[PDB]
Amino acid sequence: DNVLRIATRQSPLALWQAHYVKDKLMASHPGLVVELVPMVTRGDVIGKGLFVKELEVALLENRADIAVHSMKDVPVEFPQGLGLVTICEREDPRDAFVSNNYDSLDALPAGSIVGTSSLRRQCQLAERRPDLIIRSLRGNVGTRLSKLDNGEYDAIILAVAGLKRLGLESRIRAALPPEISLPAVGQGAVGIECRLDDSRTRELLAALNHHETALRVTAERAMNTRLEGACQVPIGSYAELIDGEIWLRGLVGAPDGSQIIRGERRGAPQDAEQMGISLAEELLNNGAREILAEVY
Ligand SMILES: *Cc1[nH]c(Cc2[nH]cc(CCC(=O)O)c2CC(=O)O)c(CCC(=O)O)c1CC(=O)O
Numbered sequence: 366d367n368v369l370r371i372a373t374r375q376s377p378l379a380l381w382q383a384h385y386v387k388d389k390l391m392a393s394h395p396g397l398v399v400e401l402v403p404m405v406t407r408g409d410v411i412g413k414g415l416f417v418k419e420l421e422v423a424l425l426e427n428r429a430d431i432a433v434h435s436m437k438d439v440p441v442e443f444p445q446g447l448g449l450v451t452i453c454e455r456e457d458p459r460d461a462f463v464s465n466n467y468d469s470l471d472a473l474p475a476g477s478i479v480g481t482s483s484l485r486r487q488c489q490l491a492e493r494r495p496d497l498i499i500r501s502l503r504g505n506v507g508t509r510l511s512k513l514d515n516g517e518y519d520a521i522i523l524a525v526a527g528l529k530r531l532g533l534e535s536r537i538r539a540a541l542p543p544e545i546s547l548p549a550v551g552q553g554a555v556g557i558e559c560r561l562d563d564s565r566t567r568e569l570l571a572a573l574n575h576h577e578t579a580l581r582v583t584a585e586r587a588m589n590t591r592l593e594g595a596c597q598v599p600i601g602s603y604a605e606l607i608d609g610e611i612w613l614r615g616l617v618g619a620p621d622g623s624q625i626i627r628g629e630r631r632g633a634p635q636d637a638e639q640m641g642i643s644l645a646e647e648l649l650n651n652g653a654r655e656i657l658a659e660v661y
Pocket residue numbers: 376377378379408416435437438480481482483484485486502503504505506507522549595596597
């Protein structure tokens with residue numbers, strides 16, 4: 366076959382991601398015909414893998430060859446025969462402070478309403494500023510920006526990568542350093558899932574793998590796997606390559622910001638997976654187990 370079918374969600378950001386993968390595949394393999402198969406997910410309407418399940422069914426029944434996701438949305442477990450095989454070059458991994466009326470988090474007055482449905486984002490903000498009111502916010506990037514503009518929130522937190530890819534860089538009032546808001550696992554990277562026995566597809570995808578990003582995300586995911594994490598839990602997991610070593614930082618927090626368990630590991634790139642697992646067991650042994658129990 367000379368055709369590759371791409372399964373993707375149907376929001377403006379998911380289609381931007383699908384086009385980025387399609388452009389990269391055409392640049393490496395000029396005779397390939399790339400087709401798009403956009404589809405809704407449970408996540409779009411309201412096991413887990415709320416943003417991926419219908420995509421994976423597409424692959425199992427040979428309706429698509431690859432599924433393109435934002436890495437933070439990929440679950441730590443997969444149906445047999447599927448896996449994540451390519452991790453694309455990481456874009457800015459930071460959280461962003463978005464507000465029409467305020468210039469920074471410090472400028473919000475007590476009682477101001479900040480929208481986010483991420484317990485990872487909430488625990489960290491509540492830890493520093495218990496005077497702010499953190500209210501759930503759901504929806505695609507443009508739906509969230511509308512609710513801000515309609516005055517339902519004073520500010521909201523989104524990933525910088527999403528806003529930059531949509532050409533909405535002007536809505537970023539401030540990129541929050543990882544030390545103020547530790548990113549979710551894989552934040553900023555696009556991941557490609559496919560059928561593991563499909564060697565033709567896996568060969569076509571190799572040119573898209575970004576080694577340095579794959580090392581970072583491997584360590585972040587090994588941590589989350591051990592904690593049995595996902596988007597609904599208050600876990601931050603973030604790796605940087607600093608002078609030839611991986612520096613992994615992780616946190617597990619109580620949603621009210623009362624208790625936050627933090628840890629860090631530094632090591633050789635070859636040990637990315639074992640470093641993540643070790644970090645996760647240090648957190649669990651330190652009280653992360655009970656915080657997650659009270660979540661789940
Ligand atoms: C892991 C994680 N995912 C999300 C939210 C998310 N993922 C995909 C979408 C649709 C984006 C679009 O296509 O424009 C969304 C947003 C949604 O459907 O509500 C989160 C939540 C972020 C938050 O509410 O702040 C998380 C958890 C995390 O980042 O820690």
